[PDB]
Amino acid sequence: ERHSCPLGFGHYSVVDVCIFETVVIVLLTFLIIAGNLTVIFVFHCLHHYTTSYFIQTMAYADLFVGVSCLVPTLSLLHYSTGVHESLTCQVFGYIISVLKSVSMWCLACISVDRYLAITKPLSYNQLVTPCRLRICIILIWIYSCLIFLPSFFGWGKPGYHGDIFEWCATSWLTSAYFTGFIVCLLYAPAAFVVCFTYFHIFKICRQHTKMKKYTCTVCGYIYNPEDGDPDNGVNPGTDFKDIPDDWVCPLCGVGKDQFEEVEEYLMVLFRITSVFYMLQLPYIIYFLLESSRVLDNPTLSFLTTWLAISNSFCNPVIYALSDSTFRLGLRRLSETMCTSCMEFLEV
């Protein structure tokens, strides 16, 4: 299967061809499959519930991005089936664009859900239900498929996700009509949805100055400033900063040094949202310029394409690494291996 391998410009040879492209794809295919499979076995096999479902969905969306990315890696690894390249780069580029819309929308629905919880706190549970959230999921899956369905009916190229394959990078051409359609009906709406919700959510929060929770890095005790530690002289309504240095963890006795601020779940979702929408921003700028024929650059086409695909890997990393309990799981894991390493070494 022939590939478009523009990196290492003019330095490639019969043994060196498609090496920088192959490391990027093979790493991302691995990091996205592994990174989401860990998240769905730890948290998706008990938070704010509606968001827990949008996050669960975009976990399977991001996993199947990397599962699809097994196609380029195996073609780049000289494994082939007796099927035209024009077809496998047409199907893959469709599947990825759709999955990329499913995750992009999932982050737009979380943003609205958190908007509605904060703006209509009386009505929130009366607007959101287990049937409404379930019909909202399938409408993302239907809408995403239908914005990238024209590619199968001669409207043009819906992205550069298959431009690693030769046929898609030189034979299929993006049409400004099709690109404008996608941008206006998918990229522009989600971007404005998440810009309006997170602007107003932080507009409201900036007035209401809530006191920060802190967790014990050793055992996982949460100092909740609304409760305090009344047994040990700590009045409720005292921030962690105000407790004297003398104070110690009630569950294990470690000092105020061993306590990290518990990050707010909204702020985690704003980070996942800003990383995701910023990692595919270069790719939409290139997608607009090339469709407008103001620019053609296969290297800029490849970097922005895989910089976007990489946000299927950042999603599970921001989510698990912003959570205090997952982190503790890893520190207890290292110790389990260490004490067993001290033990297996007793010989």
Ligand X SMILES: CCCCCCCC/C=C\CCCCCCCC(=O)OC[C@H](O)CO
Residue 219 interacts, among Zn ion, ligand X, none and using kind-specific CB cut-offs from 5 to 8 Å, with: Zn ion
CB of 334 to Zn ion, least distance (A): 17
**Whole-number Å distance between alpha carbons of 94 and 159:** 8
180 binds ligand X (CB under 6 A): yes
Instruction: For residue 216, say whether it is annotated as part of any ligand binding site.
Output: yes
3-state helix, strand, coil in the chain (%, to 5): 65, 5, 30
221 binds Zn ion (CB under 5 A): yes
Instruction: For residue 89, say whether it is annotated as part of any ligand binding site.
Output: no
Cβ closest to ligand X, residue 18 vs residue 243: 18
Residue 331 interacts, among Zn ion, ligand X, none and using kind-specific CB cut-offs from 5 to 8 Å, with: ligand X
User: Structure tokens of 346?
Assistant: 């007793």
Residues paired with 269 in a beta bridge: none
145 binds ligand X (CB under 6 A): no
Residues 236/225, Cβ–Cβ less than 8 Å: yes
218 binds Zn ion (CB under 5 A): yes
CA distance from start to end of the chain: 54
Stretch that binds Zn ion, among 144-152, 218-226, 237-245, 275-283 (CB under 5 A): 218-226
When binding is defined by CB under 6 A, the residue of 184, 195, 222, 251 that contacts ligand X is 184
Lookup result for tokens 């948290």: 43
Closest CA to 305 of 152, 105, 97: 97
Residues 305/283, Cβ–Cβ less than 8 Å: yes
Catalogue the E-assigned strands of the chain.
Answer: 214-216, 222-223, 259-261
327 binds ligand X (CB under 6 A): yes
Instruction: For residue 252, say whether it is annotated as part of any ligand binding site.
Output: yes
59 binds ligand X (CB under 6 A): no
Lookup result for tokens 């002289």: 233
Q: Are strands 222-223 and 259-261 parallel, antiparallel or unpaired?
A: unpaired
Could you tell me where the DSSP H helices lie in 13-84?
Answer: 20-42, 50-68, 70-76
When binding is defined by CB under 5 A, the residue of 17, 222, 252, 330 that contacts Zn ion is 252
**Whole-number Å distance between alpha carbons of 267 and 206:** 13
CB of 295 to ligand X, least distance (A): 10
Instruction: For residue 18, say whether it is annotated as part of any ligand binding site.
Output: no
Cβ closest to ligand X, residue 15 vs residue 342: 15
Stretch that binds Zn ion, among 56-64, 67-75, 210-218, 288-296 (CB under 5 A): 210-218
Q: Which of residues 1-20 bind ligand X (CB under 6 A)?
A: 15, 17-19
Torsion of CA 79, 85, 88, 93, to 10 degrees: 120
Degrees to nearest 5, angle at CA 8 with 6 and 14: 85
52 binds ligand X (CB under 6 A): no
Residue 249 interacts, among Zn ion, ligand X, none and using kind-specific CB cut-offs from 5 to 8 Å, with: Zn ion
Residues 96/68, Cβ–Cβ less than 8 Å: yes
Cβ closest to Zn ion, residue 108 vs residue 216: 216
259 binds Zn ion (CB under 5 A): no
**Whole-number Å distance between alpha carbons of 194 and 103:** 13
**Whole-number Å distance between alpha carbons of 231 and 238:** 14
**Whole-number Å distance between alpha carbons of 179 and 10:** 31
Q: Which of residues 264-323 bind ligand X (CB under 6 A)?
A: 270-271, 274-275, 278-279, 282, 297, 299-300, 303-304, 307, 310, 314, 317-318, 321-322
Residues 68/137, Cβ–Cβ less than 8 Å: no
Cβ closest to Zn ion, residue 146 vs residue 251: 251
Residue numbers of the site for ligand X (CB under 6 A)?
A: 15, 17-19, 22-23, 26, 34, 37-38, 41-42, 150, 155, 177-178, 180-181, 184, 270-271, 274-275, 278-279, 282, 297, 299-300, 303-304, 307, 310, 314, 317-318, 321-322, 327, 330-331, 333-334
Annotated binding site for Fe cation: 216, 219, 249, 252
User: Contact positions toward Zn ion, by CB under 5 A?
Assistant: 216, 218-219, 221, 249, 251-252
